[PDB]
Amino acid sequence: GRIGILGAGLAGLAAATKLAEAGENVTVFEARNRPGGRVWSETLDTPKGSYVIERGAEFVLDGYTSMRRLLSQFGLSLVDTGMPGDTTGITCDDIIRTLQGTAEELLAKLPDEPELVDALRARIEISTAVSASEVTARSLQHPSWRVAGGNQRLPDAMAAALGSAVRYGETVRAVENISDGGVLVTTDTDTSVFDTVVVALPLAVIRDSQLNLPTTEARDAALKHVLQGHAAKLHLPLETQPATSAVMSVEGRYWTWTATDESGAVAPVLNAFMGSPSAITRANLKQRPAEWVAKARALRTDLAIPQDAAALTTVWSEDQLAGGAYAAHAPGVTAAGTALLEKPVGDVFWAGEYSEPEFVGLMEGAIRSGERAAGRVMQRLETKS
Numbered sequence: 001g002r003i004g005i006l007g008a009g010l011a012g013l014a015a016a017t018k019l020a021e022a023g024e025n026v027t028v029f030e031a032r033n034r035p036g037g038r039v040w041s042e043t044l045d046t047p048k049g050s051y052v053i054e055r056g057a058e059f060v061l062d063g064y065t066s067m068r069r070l071l072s073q074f075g076l077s078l079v080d081t082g083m084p085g086d087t088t089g090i091t092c093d094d095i096i097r098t099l100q101g102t103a104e105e106l107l108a109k110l111p112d113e114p115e116l117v118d119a120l121r122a123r124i125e126i127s128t129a130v131s132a133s134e135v136t137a138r139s140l141q142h143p144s145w146r147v148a149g150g151n152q153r154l155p156d157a158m159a160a161a162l163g164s165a166v167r168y169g170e171t172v173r174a175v176e177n178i179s180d181g182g183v184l185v186t187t188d189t190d191t192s193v194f195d196t197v198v199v200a201l202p203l204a205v206i207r208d209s210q211l212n213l214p215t216t217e218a219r220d221a222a223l224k225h226v227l228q229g230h231a232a233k234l235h236l237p238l239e240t241q242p243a244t245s246a247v248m249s250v251e252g253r254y255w256t257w258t259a260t261d262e263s264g265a266v267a268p269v270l271n272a273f274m275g276s277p278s279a280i281t282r283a284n285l286k287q288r289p290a291e292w293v294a295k296a297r298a299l300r301t302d303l304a305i306p307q308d309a310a311a312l313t314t315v316w317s318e319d320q321l322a323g324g325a326y327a328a329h330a331p332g333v334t335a336a337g338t339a340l341l342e343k344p345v346g347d348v349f350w351a352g353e354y355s356e357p358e359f360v361g362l363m364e365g366a367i368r369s370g371e372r373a374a375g376r377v378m379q380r381l382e383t384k385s
């Protein structure tokens, strides 16, 4: 009755936790030496002391009811974050007024006022993390918390409860269905055998040519409409507690914010998120990272950034175990194609943020997807027996 789960992100850990509770025997393969995947919490030293920062996923939003259930069971608390003018809203209203096609095709229909149109384009590109020329126009249609002590405390606790079932330092390279039943999971070192497997790997990993996973023409047809969002997290220390804030940069395609932690004080950390691959390339975070600090300092003259400060950068696009930040939708995504993506191929099931139909791309979606896959696996094992 052996189940193999590939990836110890929220999707894989949620699948494994539900299967463990059902009394099944699970093994979780994780390439990193930590759980959580794109949930990754660390501390940043500042002149006021050390503060938790989110190098990946940050905000728990309204409606994250599966994650809230898990936080309750693992004893973890949510902390309120405490967080040109309006012309972008009106311009987006005119935009809608004019859901087929791409956002850019709709922006092209607006009166040709380029700085204002580009301000709206930037808002779209930051949040969808893709070019406006590729994302569905339906994205134009579109209070917060963080986990006390770091969002990664949740996957940390889920993994800890699975104990020796979680196998770190294991890089999956192939997954093969066997005709008479069962699955072979091959890492860089050796192969294991399972009755069923849940692939809970990133979108970019399951589409990577360096891995041999089960595929079908129907899946390939649905996957081609799922875009890879790209984003980088950036953090700077501050010399004193600021007000809470949220301030966007049009030219840089990034957002900055300052937020309260469990103490009730606003942490002296400038948090930042840059979205869309062309923005990250224009920023040149790897080569000349003082440039972005200079831009951030100019954007946020109200914040006291030390003069010799260097940004902490987390460019998930360059991590072969992530390959981007989250999924986005091209115009051609359908509910039926999205549903297809979680159906098994042989005895190989699937979970991840990219196949969630409502909370697409979010921590809540990864959890919900993992828990759906666990339910499908339990039906398959009931069948095999």
Ligand SMILES: Cc1cc2nc3c(=O)[nH]c(=O)nc-3n(C[C@H](O)[C@H](O)[C@H](O)COP(=O)(O)OP(=O)(O)OC[C@H]3O[C@@H](n4cnc5c(N)ncnc54)[C@H](O)[C@@H]3O)c2cc1C
Pocket (backbone or CB within 6 Å): 006, 007, 008, 009, 010, 011, 012, 029, 030, 031, 032, 035, 036, 037, 038, 039, 055, 056, 057, 058, 059, 060, 170, 171, 172, 173, 200, 201, 202, 205, 231, 232, 233, 316, 320, 321, 322, 324, 325, 326, 351, 352, 353, 354, 361, 362, 363, 364, 366
């Ligand atoms: C910068 C950034 C900001 C975000 N902001 C938010 C936010 O504010 N709120 C929100 O809800 N969501 C946000 N997210 C999205 C959220 O991080 C994801 O939806 C979610 O964490 C994805 O979980 P997953 O389990 O699907 O994938 P992952 O977390 O990527 O887990 C997949 C796992 O597979 C492992 N792995 C990869 N390749 C292999 C291999 N070959 N063999 C074995 N293991 C392998 C990885 O190491 C990883 O542990 C953000 C993401 C990023 C990157």
